[PDB]
Amino acid sequence: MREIVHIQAGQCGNQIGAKFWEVISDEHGIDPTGSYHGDSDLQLERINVYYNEATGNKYVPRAILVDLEPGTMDSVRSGPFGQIFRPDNFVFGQSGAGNNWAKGHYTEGAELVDSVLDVVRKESESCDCLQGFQLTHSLGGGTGSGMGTLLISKIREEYPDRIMNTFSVMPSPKVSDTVVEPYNATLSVHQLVENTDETYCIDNEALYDICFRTLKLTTPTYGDLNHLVSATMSGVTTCLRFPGQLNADLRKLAVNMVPFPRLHFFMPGFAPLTSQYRALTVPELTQQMFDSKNMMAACDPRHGRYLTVAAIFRGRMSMKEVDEQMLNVQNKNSSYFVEWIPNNVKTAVCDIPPRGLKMSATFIGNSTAIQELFKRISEQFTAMFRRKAFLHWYTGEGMDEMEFTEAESNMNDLVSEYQQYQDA
Amino acid sequence: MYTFVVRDENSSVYAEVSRLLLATGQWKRLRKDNPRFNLMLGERNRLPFGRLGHEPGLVQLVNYYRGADKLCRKASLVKLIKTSPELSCTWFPESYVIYPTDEREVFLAAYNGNVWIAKSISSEASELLDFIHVIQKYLEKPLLLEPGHRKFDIRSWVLVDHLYNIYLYREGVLRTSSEPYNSADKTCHLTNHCIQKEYSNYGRYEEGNEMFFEEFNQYLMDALNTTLENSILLQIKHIIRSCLMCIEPAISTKHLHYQSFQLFGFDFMVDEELKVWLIEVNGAPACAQKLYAELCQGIVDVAISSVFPLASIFIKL
Amino acid sequence: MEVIELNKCTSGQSFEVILKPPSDPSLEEIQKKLEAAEERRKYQEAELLKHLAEKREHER
Amino acid sequence: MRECISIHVGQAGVQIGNACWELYCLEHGIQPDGQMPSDKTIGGGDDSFNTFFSETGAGKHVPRAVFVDLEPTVIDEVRTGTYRQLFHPEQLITGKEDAANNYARGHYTIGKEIIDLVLDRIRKLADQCTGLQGFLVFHSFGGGTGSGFTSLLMERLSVDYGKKSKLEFSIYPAPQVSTAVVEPYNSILTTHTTLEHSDCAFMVDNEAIYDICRRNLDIERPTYTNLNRLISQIVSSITASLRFDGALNVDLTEFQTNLVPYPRIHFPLATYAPVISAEKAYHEQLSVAEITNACFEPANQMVKCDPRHGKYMACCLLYRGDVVPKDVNAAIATIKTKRSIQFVDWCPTGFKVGINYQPPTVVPGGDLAKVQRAVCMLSNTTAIAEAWARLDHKFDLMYAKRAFVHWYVGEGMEEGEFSEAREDMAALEKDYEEVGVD
Numbered sequence A: 001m002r003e004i005v006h007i008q009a010g011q012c013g014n015q016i017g018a019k020f021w022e023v024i025s026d027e028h029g030i031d032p033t034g035s036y037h038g039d040s041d042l043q044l045e046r047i048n049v050y051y052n053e054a055t056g057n058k059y060v061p062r063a064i065l066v067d068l069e070p071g072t073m074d075s076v077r078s079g080p081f082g083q084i085f086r087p088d089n090f091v092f093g094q095s096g097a098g099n100n101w102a103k104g105h106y107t108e109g110a111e112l113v114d115s116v117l118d119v120v121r122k123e124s125e126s127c128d129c130l131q132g133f134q135l136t137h138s139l140g141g142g143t144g145s146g147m148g149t150l151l152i153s154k155i156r157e158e159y160p161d162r163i164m165n166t167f168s169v170m171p172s173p174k175v176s177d178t179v180v181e182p183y184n185a186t187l188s189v190h191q192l193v194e195n196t197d198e199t200y201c202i203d204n205e206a207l208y209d210i211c212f213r214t215l216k217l218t219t220p221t222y223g224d225l226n227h228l229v230s231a232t233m234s235g236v237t238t239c240l241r242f243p244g245q246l247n248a249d250l251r252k253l254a255v256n257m258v259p260f261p262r263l264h265f266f267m268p269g270f271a272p273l274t275s276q277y278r279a280l281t282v283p284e285l286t287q288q289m290f291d292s293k294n295m296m297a298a299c300d301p302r303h304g305r306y307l308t309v310a311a312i313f314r315g316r317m318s319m320k321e322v323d324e325q326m327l328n329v330q331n332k333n334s335s336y337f338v339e340w341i342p343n344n345v346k347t348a349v350c351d352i353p354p355r356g357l358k359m360s361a362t363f364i365g366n367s368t369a370i371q372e373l374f375k376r377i378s379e380q381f382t383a384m385f386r387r388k389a390f391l392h393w394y395t396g397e398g399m400d401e402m403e404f405t406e407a408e409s410n411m412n413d414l415v416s417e418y419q420q421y422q423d424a
Numbered sequence B: 001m002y003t004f005v006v007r008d009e010n011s012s013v014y015a016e017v018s019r020l021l022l023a024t025g026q027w028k029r030l031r032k033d034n035p036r037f038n039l040m041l042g043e044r045n046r047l048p049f050g051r052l053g054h055e056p057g058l059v060q061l062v063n064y065y066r067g068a069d070k071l072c073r074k075a076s077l078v079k080l081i082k083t084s085p086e087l088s089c090t091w092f093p094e095s096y097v098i099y100p101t102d103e104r105e106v107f108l109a110a111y112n113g114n115v116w117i118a119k120s121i122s123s124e125a126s127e128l129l130d131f132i133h134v135i136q137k138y139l140e141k142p143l144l145l146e147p148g149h150r151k152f153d154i155r156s157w158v159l160v161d162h163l164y165n166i167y168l169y170r171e172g173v174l175r176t177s178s179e180p181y182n183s184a185d186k187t188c189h190l191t192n193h194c195i196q197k198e199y200s201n202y203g204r205y206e207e208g209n210e211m212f213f214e215e216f217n218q219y220l221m222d223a224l225n226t227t228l229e230n231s232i233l234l235q236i237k238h239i240i241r242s243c244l245m246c247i248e249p250a251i252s253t254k255h256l257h258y259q260s261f262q263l264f265g266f267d268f269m270v271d272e273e274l275k276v277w278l279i280e281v282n283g284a285p286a287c288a289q290k291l292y293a294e295l296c297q298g299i300v301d302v303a304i305s306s307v308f309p310l311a312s313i314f315i316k317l
Numbered sequence C: 001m002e003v004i005e006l007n008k009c010t011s012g013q014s015f016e017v018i019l020k021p022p023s024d025p026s027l028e029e030i031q032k033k034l035e036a037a038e039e040r041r042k043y044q045e046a047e048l049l050k051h052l053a054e055k056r057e058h059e060r
Numbered sequence D: 001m002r003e004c005i006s007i008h009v010g011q012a013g014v015q016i017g018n019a020c021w022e023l024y025c026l027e028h029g030i031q032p033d034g035q036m037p038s039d040k041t042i043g044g045g046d047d048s049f050n051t052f053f054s055e056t057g058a059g060k061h062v063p064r065a066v067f068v069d070l071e072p073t074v075i076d077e078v079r080t081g082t083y084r085q086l087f088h089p090e091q092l093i094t095g096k097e098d099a100a101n102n103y104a105r106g107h108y109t110i111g112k113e114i115i116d117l118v119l120d121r122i123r124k125l126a127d128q129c130t131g132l133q134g135f136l137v138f139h140s141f142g143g144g145t146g147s148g149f150t151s152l153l154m155e156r157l158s159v160d161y162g163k164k165s166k167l168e169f170s171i172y173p174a175p176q177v178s179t180a181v182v183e184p185y186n187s188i189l190t191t192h193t194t195l196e197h198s199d200c201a202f203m204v205d206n207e208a209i210y211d212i213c214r215r216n217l218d219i220e221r222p223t224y225t226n227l228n229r230l231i232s233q234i235v236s237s238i239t240a241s242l243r244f245d246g247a248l249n250v251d252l253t254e255f256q257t258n259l260v261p262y263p264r265i266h267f268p269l270a271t272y273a274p275v276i277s278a279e280k281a282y283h284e285q286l287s288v289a290e291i292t293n294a295c296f297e298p299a300n301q302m303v304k305c306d307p308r309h310g311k312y313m314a315c316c317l318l319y320r321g322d323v324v325p326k327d328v329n330a331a332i333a334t335i336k337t338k339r340s341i342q343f344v345d346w347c348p349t350g351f352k353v354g355i356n357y358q359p360p361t362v363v364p365g366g367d368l369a370k371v372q373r374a375v376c377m378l379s380n381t382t383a384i385a386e387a388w389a390r391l392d393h394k395f396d397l398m399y400a401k402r403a404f405v406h407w408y409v410g411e412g413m414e415e416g417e418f419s420e421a422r423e424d425m426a427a428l429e430k431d432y433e434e435v436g437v438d
């Protein structure tokens, strides 16, 4: 019956995790108390994938809230749908991880991780058939980045044949907490390459630009950025939450998206970008969602090639028109799909749209231009690490320079692995 | 907006239409192996017809007719004129087929002149078979034109679109062996650019030997009181209609998942009663230099844009 | 064009027209192959738990 | 009477199973509760419909069928659909997690957990057979279950019933429907493993049925329900001779001998006409010659290919409806002239023909109009190799970069089984070229 266990970790993790659950609890008819008050019953067919059944059969998310400080988490639970979350599923330390990967992965996080795996175990033991885990987190902080990849190291150990799937927010100098972010993120990516099956790369650069250039928000807030993420995340997961000709689970998704096991970082895109009264026509949905301006990862798809693509349209619309338009975008732009993976673009449609939009289209691209993101983070990293700058924050927690060059190395390789398939 | 691959590079003719297509701002050459194409300019042979018409949302068309080799290799060709009812046939030279299918006493009952032509030349039915391959009769007396006693050879270019309209190009070429022609000595017996571009003086009695149609008609009027239309072209159009309509129910792409056009070169000969004869049907023909521009454009109008619209020089048969 | 072997009945008919005439692996061996697949699976799972265990050593 | 047991494997096999068995019921007048009022031999019978149905003392007519999916979701709809009572709990079989479109996961990994249970469920049906003649296995090429598990079951069915014939209905993958980008992998893998174990296999290209469902039914996108309800018609005509009084193709051994001269080349091309829309309300009903003619249009074939550029090795015509032999030889006389229909030198140019006078049944409120007469042609033509060439190319494109191979190795398979299975198909392509050209 194919559940996912959702884990949100850190400040960014739990803020984005929080909106995602209100966004889709609205989509499933669940109120802030956990009680279902929807019209359809398609709202309840795949409900079990994200929600456990409850009291007078209310619905609690299958979510685990993780942090090394309580601040964000108190904020979540005193926020809107903060009541729906199982209070036992609030696992938190007190010291924080100081924007420090090592504190999350080796010291502070190490102390807390066992308590989290107790909650993952009780959430997952109550699963007739669990299919995988999805983790939300940033990679530039300490908790979501350092502890989050520790958690994945552990979940992989206890559950080696489940899918591990993350939504990962990349640091960008444009929208930065601290200067050590490329360090934290290079170290997280070394982990993600090994221990996840699929990672959606949400770049904070791109969310800023969409907010500024497109949505016309002069100075965007983190809430404005997480508006775009909770809409993409709702989008990316509608197949798992709603029934269709597609019997969509994490493993089938990974099987068709990932040709080579390391190359599993996806460029999400969304259309329309909203912060609106004419529904977009299908020809625009598909022109927009493939436009670089609607990508969440801040890489130009025309700078690389799509290994694989997965698109979904939400609303009631011409199933033939999306077929036609989808097939048409491939031939206007066949230079940008790989000749050696036949039929590498797959398209689903859902009759139920997101709140407020009558027609929406979400895009998932395994493009070799995602390399730009890692090239970007790698330049920044080297820029500091050549002068060994800010390293004391990490050597103070047991880490050695060697661990750093290995992480620099594994990511420069991943960039080579991506360039070689751009040339084929 | 239209796409097309090119999979025969040294195709003299189609190299040029690939030029013309790009030069309209409405056609894009993809790489050979890109499958999402509108139009294939396929390879000479082993053209993978079985992989066309299978890309959803793609109208696909190729510049070749699967099965047309049966007309274009003298083995299958000869075979076609005897096996098929629609070909009885008073314009093809009498013919058989030998292997180093197989029936050879065929070649005997007719032997009481007796001269034949060796390639796939002699009067001796023995030295030939040392090749150990089609081998048949040489017109011991052709029409021979003057001033200069030049034994010639006519090539016509025929286009067949996806609808199987048969289009004769109005410009034929006449490739003459402008030098003398004797008996028995194997030079003017063969008239084109294979024994006269190597062995055999490459344009004596005019420009490169190569009479086009306007002149040959004027000669015929002056030399014979007839026209090219009446003496020859009627017979040519009859030959072309008859071959291509024999094989039509075997190669027609009317109700199948892709579609075909193709350009053929027909090679004819004349005698003095101005009887026209058919030698070979060329399936990949090159054009005459002065005509490339006009024929290669006519291919696009009738065979390519008739199926892919945008924003005569042929005689329909 | 010659007809052969016509059979009628209540349901209908069948016949043949002619227009011209002419001119195993045993179980134990899949037992091997199939269990030889389960062992390279568990070799792969072992070498995974081995690297995870090395990672705990580094963590520690 | 010799019984036939049917095995529907995977999402495609099961769902087509529903379409076929529902049609079978409508055709033999069996009701959603297994009652067959027209059946007088109560709870027993040697009738030809008993080839596919056994009976209970309470008069229930129960398919000689086993449904098996590595995942409950689809077969569950059988367990709670209109024909829930038709079946016995034991003959619908589900696993926990499916093969995730992975041949190696359905064959090797999840294969062995279910194979000994499913053969046992088959032995249950085999044991109430007084003369079982073999099985008819329905499955997709593309699914992990359809491909991977079926090739494992086809291995064991050979060892447990080596004296029984095994006929396949296989769904060939097509992007206009279809799922995994790796279906070319599953396709090559499963035919290479099932080849020496199948006696006769009817390929149905989803692309052909789609197009048919669009042109002849004016259905913009067709559903699985559309596709399957049409596939059911073709299967019904192919199977009708085992379920009805007849003299042609009355047992599975007859399909081999009538359609398959060499065991490797056991994929007959199927052509079926007519396909008429139920919302084309005024319609001119087609003659015998018109429908026999359409048997030679590529656009009616279960696999799009050009039979004009290969040789035949057997022709079978099966007519349902208002057909008499005279009209058939008159249409064959015409069509022999009009059309290039070249048999192999060492085979008779000729048609084995069968007529059942009950015209095709169409599902009430379905999409096909009922027609006065219909034909289905089984031709063993070498032009079906076009579908292998297509499949094998898509396979070459990916496997030259080893795309997605790691998902298979991760399950125990070895790249060698990839190139072993691709060389088998290279040989199967040469076979078809020998028989087909000079």
Ligand SMILES: Nc1nc2c(ncn2[C@@H]2O[C@H](COP(=O)(O)OP(=O)(O)OP(=O)(O)O)[C@@H](O)[C@H]2O)c(=O)[nH]1
Pocket: D009, D010, D011, D012, D013, D015, D016, D069, D070, D071, D098, D099, D100, D101, D102, D139, D140, D141, D142, D143, D144, D145, D146, D147, D171, D172, D173, D174, D177, D178, D179, D180, D183, D206, D224, D227, D228, D231
């Ligand atoms: N014609 C037809 N094709 C189907 C049907 N269901 C699935 N397919 C096709 O089968 C392929 C997918 O295989 P499935 O049968 O769904 O796979 P499965 O056997 O369930 O195996 P897994 O789900 O991987 O465990 C694709 O090519 C689909 O187009 C159906 O009901 N009718």
Ligand SMILES: Nc1ncnc2c1ncn2[C@@H]1O[C@H](COP(=O)(O)OP(=O)(O)CP(=O)(O)O)[C@@H](O)[C@H]1O
Pocket: B093, B117, B119, B120, B136, B137, B138, B139, B140, B152, B153, B189, B190, B191, B192, B194, B267, B279, B280, B282
């Ligand atoms: N029946 C015939 N009588 C007299 N001359 C003949 C003849 N058939 C051919 N010829 C001569 O043979 C030379 C033409 O050669 P041909 O067209 O057959 O090329 P070819 O054999 O190389 C086939 P391809 O173009 O495919 O390579 C001609 O000038 C021509 O006069």
Ligand SMILES: Nc1nc2c(ncn2[C@@H]2O[C@H](COP(=O)(O)OP(=O)(O)O)[C@@H](O)[C@H]2O)c(=O)[nH]1
Pocket: A009, A010, A011, A012, A013, A015, A016, A097, A098, A099, A100, A138, A139, A140, A141, A142, A143, A144, A145, A169, A170, A171, A172, A175, A176, A177, A178, A181, A204, A207, A222, A223, A225, A226, A229
């Ligand atoms: N998009 C987005 N990014 C965030 C949010 N909060 C923090 N970030 C980013 O996350 C990184 C800092 O990590 P953070 O989550 O604050 O630290 P942690 O609590 O130790 O995991 C920086 O790159 C911030 O730009 C948020 O709500 N939305």
Ligand SMILES: COc1ccc(-c2[nH]nc3c2-c2cc(OC)c(OC)c(OC)c2CC3)cc1
Pocket: A235, A236, A237, A238, A239, A240, A246, A247, A248, A249, A250, A252, A253, A256, A257, A308, A309, A310, A311, A312, A343, A344, A345, A346, A347, A348, A364, D179, D180, D181
């Ligand atoms: C590149 O070719 C392919 C891509 C994906 C799949 C697949 N198989 N099964 C599923 C999916 C799938 C697709 C989804 O997008 C269409 C999808 O939505 C995000 C989606 O939701 C997460 C899923 C999950 C359900 C198949 C082929």
Ligand SMILES: [Ca+2]
Pocket: A095, A107, A108, A111
């Ligand atoms: Ca501490």
Ligand SMILES: [Ca+2]
Pocket: D039, D040, D041, D042, D043, D044, D045, D047, D055
């Ligand atoms: Ca009975």
Ligand SMILES: [Mg+2]
Pocket: A011, A141, A177
């Ligand atoms: Mg922070």
Ligand SMILES: [Mg+2]
Pocket: D010, D011, D069, D070, D071, D098, D143, D145
């Ligand atoms: Mg399935």
